[PDB]
């Protein structure tokens, strides 16, 4: 996402930058979202939705 950076990057662009590439990065994302998805964590961001 464009989060405190200019432009946002193709998921492949992100893989080469870590040397462990590809499908690897595509799972870290989903688990990170999954992590921020349920509570302790979910509570705060949830309230921004109307």
């Amino acid at each position: 996402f464009g989060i405190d950076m200019n432009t946002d990057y193709t998921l492949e662009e992100v893989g080469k930058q870590f040397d462990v590439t590809r499908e690897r990065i595509r799972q870290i994302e989903a688990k990170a979202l999954r992590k921020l998805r349920h509570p302790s964590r979910s509570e705060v961001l949830r309230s921004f939705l109307d």
Binding site: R37, H38, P39, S40, S42, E43, R46
Partner: protein, 319 residues
């Protein structure tokens, strides 16, 4: 070193109106109990009066039934004063039915073992076309004082019955109270006094029943008055919610299909803190869930941001 009063002749003179007398009264307690009883007689007395009403073919207070000469707004305002008395029950739904060119009185209701229509001539409305016919579900509760219509929607949570027209609640059977203490000398005593409490009921409290439950409150109030324990409250409630509050809302909020709505009643799951922790394993073995039946539940949990089947080693805390 004191005396104590009691109630001699209670003298009815109408169903509505009676002078109850209290003989053994000391110098000045007359006006003391006299005023302080009027205060608790005019307000705090228990009373039942019609709360909601559904009528056959009418949608709101502001319409017109065919072949009747009142308007729904007037019939409601006629019911507010319908004087009933009921016993063991707390809310009873009476039914009204009558046709034909003819004044529908209070007597034209149907009786329940507890319903006593203390005035059956009371006009409710007039029909006016041979085969014009009304039917209504009048609902009477019983409370304390004056609960006006408006405040009776904040509990909402599906009061949807468009038909139900709410009427302002006048839960009380005192109309007007008046004491006068005339002096009364029991043969030997320096000077004691009487207390004639003249009162004006709606017909549905027998004077003695009242004046007793009046004095009762005064006690429970004065109960805390006797000693004064400087009392206060614990306070400082809890500021630590673990989970996301979303897991404390009922499964209605999930806005799901009917075959799936009763099915979480069945397998014992009200709050979504339990739907959250029941895997797909748990679901074919539950009454009436299938290929088409369970695809529905994985989609309304996605939109709100939850998933099916996970844990939380602490559900639900803690009071």
């Amino acid at each position: 070193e004191f005396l104590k009063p009691r109630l001699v002749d209670i003298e009815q003179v109408s169903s509505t109106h009676a002078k109850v007398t209290l003989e053994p009264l000391e110098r000045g307690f007359g006006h003391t109990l006299g005023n302080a009883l009027r205060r608790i007689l005019l307000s705090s007395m228990p009373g039942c009066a019609v709360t909601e009403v559904e009528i056959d073919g009418v949608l709101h207070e502001y319409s017109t039934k065919e072949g009747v000469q009142e308007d729904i707004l007037e019939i409601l305002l006629n019911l507010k004063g319908l004087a009933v008395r009921v016993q063991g029950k707390d809310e009873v739904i009476l039914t009204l039915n009558k046709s034909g060119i003819g004044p529908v009185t209070a007597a034209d209701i149907t009786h329940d073992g507890d319903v006593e229509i203390v005035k059956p001539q009371h006009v409710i409305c007039h029909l006016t076309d041979e085969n014009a016919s009304i039917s209504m579900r009048i609902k009477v509760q019983r409370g304390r004082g004056y609960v006006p219509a408006s405040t009776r929607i904040h509990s909402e949570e599906d009061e949807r019955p468009i038909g139900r027209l709410l009427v302002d609640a006048c839960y009380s059977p005192v109309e007007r109270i008046a004491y006068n203490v005339e002096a009364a000398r029991v043969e030997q005593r320096t000077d004691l006094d009487k207390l004639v409490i003249e009162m004006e009921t709606n017909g549905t409290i027998d004077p003695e029943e009242a004046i007793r439950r009046a004095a009762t409150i005064l006690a429970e109030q004065l109960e805390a008055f006797v000693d004064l324990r400087d009392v206060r409250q614990p306070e400082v409630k809890e500021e630590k919610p673990e989970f996301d509050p979303i897991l404390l809302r009922p499964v209605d909020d999930l806005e799901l299909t009917v075959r799936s709505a009763n099915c979480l009643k069945a397998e014992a799951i009200h709050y979504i803190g339990d739907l959250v922790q029941r895997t797909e394993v748990e679901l074919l073995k539950t009454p009436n869930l299938g290929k088409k039946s369970l695809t529905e539940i994985k989609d309304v949990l996605a939109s709100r941001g939850l998933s099916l089947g996970m844990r939380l080693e602490n559900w639900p805390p803690a009071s």
